């Protein structure tokens, strides 16, 4: 900082009425411009490796500067030099890493792990001003691996900023996760979105949002408007059904140790049983949900049996389908 006198420092600290002062250290204009110029050069040198194999990729100056910048970024996120890297996250660092993600064999040859650093960047000491920008950026072309890494970063950021995010930011994250639940390109993305949705729902306290989400997920899961043949056909082709089942299972899984069991959980398990009795991705998801529910509640199952009738208890038996089971 090197301020002229304590009076100027105190005046600058208390300028913002929010109570949060200035960053401890700041990058001067010259160094900031130098770093931005390096990133711009890397971005502009993208046309030299358009059609090169990894062996030809590993030899260009573009790869050399990419490796130098990767090493610099990894060194920055190591200790006292953390507050300085924060302003470069949205515009320079995260796009750079997500672009490096597309190069699997290149990173394997160069012994680089962009995924680990990208995931670990969610625990940075991010101040209030940058939180909104990061939330807007993460929720927004990308491939399946890039989308899954983005979901992992969102999960870690939520775990690190659980009591810091506002209601608007949490709503944006929830909407992004729900949208990923209905992904039209990848299934693993949908499964990871279901996991993140369960993590989000676990921290809800008011019953009204939970009831609204349960209603939205179970609106399309009614079995009175279909037949067994139709249900089995939908279990293998329909994407909306798969997303709704994943969301309902995530909601159910967000309540592992509730005692006594709330009345809505047996109803949702009964709704999911009909889909668990079919064959397909929806059936697999429902079976996984029921198996997890029965595994987590094995300690209190003797007391939890009272929440189900005979038919409901009987419908939750054959959900583990493994080659060693017959």
């Amino acid at each position: 900082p090197s301020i002229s006198d304590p009076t100027t420092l105190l005046e600058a600290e208390r300028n913002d009425p929010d109570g949060l002062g200035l960053p401890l250290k700041s990058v001067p204009e010259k160094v900031d411009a130098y770093i931005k110029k390096q990133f711009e050069i890397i971005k502009n040198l993208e046309d030299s490796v358009v059609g090169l194999n990894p062996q030809q990729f590993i030899k260009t100056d573009y790869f050399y500067r990419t490796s130098t910048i990767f090493y610099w970024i990894k060194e920055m996120a190591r200790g006292p030099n953390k507050v300085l890297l924060v302003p470069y996250l949205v515009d320079y660092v995260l796009p750079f890493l997500i672009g490096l993600v597309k190069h699997k064999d290149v990173c394997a040859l160069a012994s680089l792990d962009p995924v680990r650093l990208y995931a670990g960047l969610g625990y940075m000491p991010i101040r209030k001003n940058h939180v909104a920008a990061i939330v807007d950026y993460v929720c927004s072309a990308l491939s399946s691996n890039q989308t899954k890494l983005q979901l992992a970063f969102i999960q870690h950021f939520l775990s690190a900023e659980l009591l810091q995010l506002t209601e608007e930011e949490k709503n944006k994250i929830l909407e992004f996760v729900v949208s990923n639940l209905y992904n039209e390109q990848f299934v693993e993305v949908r499964v990871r979105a279901a996991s993140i949705l369960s993590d989000i729902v676990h921290n809800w306290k008011e019953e009204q949002p939970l009831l609204s989400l349960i209603e939205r997920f179970a609106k399309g899961l009614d079995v009175n408007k279909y037949t067994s043949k139709e249900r089995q056909k939908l279990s293998k082709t329909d994407i909306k059904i798969h997303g709704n089942v994943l969301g309902l299972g995530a909601i159910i899984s967000a309540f592992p140790y509730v005692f006594p069991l709330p009345p809505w959980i047996p109803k949702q398990l009964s709704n999911l049983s009909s889909w668990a009795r079919t064959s397909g991705m929806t059936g697999q998801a429902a079976k996984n949900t029921i198996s997890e529910f029965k595994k987590v509640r094995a300690d209190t199952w003797k007391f939890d049996r009272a929440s189900f009738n005979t038919e409901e208890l009987e419908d939750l038996e054959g959900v583990l389908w493994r080659s060693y089971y017959a």
């Binding site: 009909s274 419908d315 054959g318 089971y325 017959a326």
Partner: protein
Amino acid sequence: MFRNNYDGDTVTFSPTGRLFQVEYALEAIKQGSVTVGLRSNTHAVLVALRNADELSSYQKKIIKCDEHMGLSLAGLAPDARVLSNYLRQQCNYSSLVFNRKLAVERAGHLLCDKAQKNTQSYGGRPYGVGLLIIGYDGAHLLEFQPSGNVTELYGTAIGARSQGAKTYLERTLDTFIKIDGNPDELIKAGVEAISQSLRDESLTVDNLSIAIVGKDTPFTIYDGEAVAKY
């Protein structure tokens, strides 16, 4: 919450005299699918209903132990394989040394004796499969539990919502007990029983397997286009 200090191994008794590992092995049968066993005065049948996905085959549930005896399984496949191999060896010994076909009751006794040894040894594990054994002619039907118990029933059902079939058999006992001389009607009765245990699921030529053995009829397994209710 509610941690159990007496469910570790099979050589520890509960303070009330229970063996929790044996009970868990018994509950392991519920994981497997549904099997139904009948018995008339002249014939005995078995009906069995899994598929990993649309590109996979279906698990075998009925195993032939000899030309006059057979079984169906529900639970762990390798345990059923070991028990079936042991029963085949016992039948072979009986047919070789004495030229005598082994009785179903003796087979149940041997299965119980073998299964008892895994509940007292420590360091091992009880069996995790339930069996339905049917035999020659009079006809016999046994239900074997991994705890080491045999029943000699007229009919029963095991695994994956089999209570409906069991209740149907309890209702229609007197109806199906005397269908001697008509194996097809007994097979149809078993098919109806196994249908009573299905939660709206249908039966096809890929999910249904049948076994029949009676007087003058050697043990026979029907699968594929042979379970088309012909």
